[PDB]
Design a protein around this nucleic acid. Structure first.
Lengths: 5, 337
DNA sequence: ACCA
């Protein structure tokens, strides 16, 4: 959830 | 048509299109489904009149708290998405393949935001998520919409990373090397273990969430050493910083990174310098440092990445949603009003 | 300071 990827 | 994942000849033809397209993205490669092994893959493509692939979309289907799936084509589709008539044809093929199982098909291509493009997409029936949700921050969208991208084609004769930078930045980059930092790179289990140590340490330092090692193991199994590379910075046998970069299509993308606690001698700058050098050595158009929250000195992501990207961040069109079940879409997605 |  946090950087995407 | 829909891709039969059990037909290796069809899969290879799809992969050849993906790897050779100027619009190719690692998150649209079929290896990305092996990384995202908790998602269900569904892939579609279009052909020209001679049967050659001209457009492709790799979708991953995830669960929701409803009876419907979330269909997501990360940084896809692979084609010129501003050619909206062709986009509609590919999206129609994707919708046929979803067979009513998803409430939305979302795609977030790396194409610049513009008013004219946003208006066209809305005119074609899509719901867009960009400037209307910006107040919710970086995580308003799944991937960051603002990205720090270094365009290396502006420097056709650059031989080394330092050739891209003003003197004041040359000094910042030289500093870790002068102080004894050395960087090696590879895509073996050894470098992955070193990365994972620094990555978990970073995540604990920031109180943020972090992926299990098996995620990166699947990525290392899916992508070879010409595609995925882990860069590891050390000083006199001490592990300091690492980063993972993926080369695909027109860009090398700095994806994950971390540093150990204590003194690190600016080792992250040495990692960046070597990752950029990889881009120069392979004649790659772009080096993408990834997302920021805002173009402000208050954002520490921007401060760090601005050392290497002096141009303005690229602002993308954001999320493009083909709404399929509007009742579920309204329950699960907010429009920023 | 952070240097994701």
């Amino acid at each position: 959830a946090x950087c995407x990827x | 048509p829909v891709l039969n994942l059990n037909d290796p000849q069809a899969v290879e033809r799809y992969e050849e299109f993906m790897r050779q397209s100027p619009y190719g993205q690692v998150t649209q490669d079929l290896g990305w489904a092996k990384v995202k092994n908790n998602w269900e893959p569904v892939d579609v493509y279009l052909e020209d009149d001679q049967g050659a692939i001209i457009a492709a979309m790799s979708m991953l289907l995830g669960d929701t708290p409803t009876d419907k799936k979330f269909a997501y084509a990360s940084k896809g589709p692979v084609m010129d998405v501003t050619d909206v008539d062709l986009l509609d044809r590919l999206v129609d093929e994707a919708v046929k393949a979803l067979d009513g199982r998803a409430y939305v098909l979302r795609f977030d291509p790396e194409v610049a935001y513009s008013d004219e493009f946003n208006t066209t997409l809305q005119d074609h029936g899509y719901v867009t998520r960009n400037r209307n949700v910006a107040d919710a921050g970086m995580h308003a969208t799944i991937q960051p919409r603002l990205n720090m991208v270094l365009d290396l084609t502006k420097f056709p004769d650059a031989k080394t990373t330092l050739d891209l930078y003003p003197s004041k930045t040359k000094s910042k980059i030289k500093r870790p090397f002068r102080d004894g930092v050395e960087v090696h790179s590879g895509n073996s289990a050894t470098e992955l273990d070193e990365f994972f140590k620094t990555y978990t340490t970073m995540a604990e330092r920031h109180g943020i969430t972090h992926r299990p090692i098996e995620y990166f193991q699947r990525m290392q199994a899916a992508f070879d050493a010409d595609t995925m590379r882990i860069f590891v910075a050390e000083r006199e046998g001490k592990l300091l910083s690492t980063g993972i970069a993926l080369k695909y299509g027109r860009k090398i993308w700095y994806m994950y990174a971390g540093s150990m606690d204590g003194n690190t001698y600016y080792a992250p700058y040495a990692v960046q310098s070597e990752m950029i050098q990889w881009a120069l050595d392979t004649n790659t158009d772009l080096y993408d440092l990834g997302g920021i929250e805002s173009e402000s000195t208050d954002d520490s992501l921007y401060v760090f990445k601005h050392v290497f990207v002096k141009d303005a961040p690229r602002e993308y069109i954001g999320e493009i949603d083909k709404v399929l079940d509007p009742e579920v879409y309204a329950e699960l997605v907010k429009d920023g009003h």
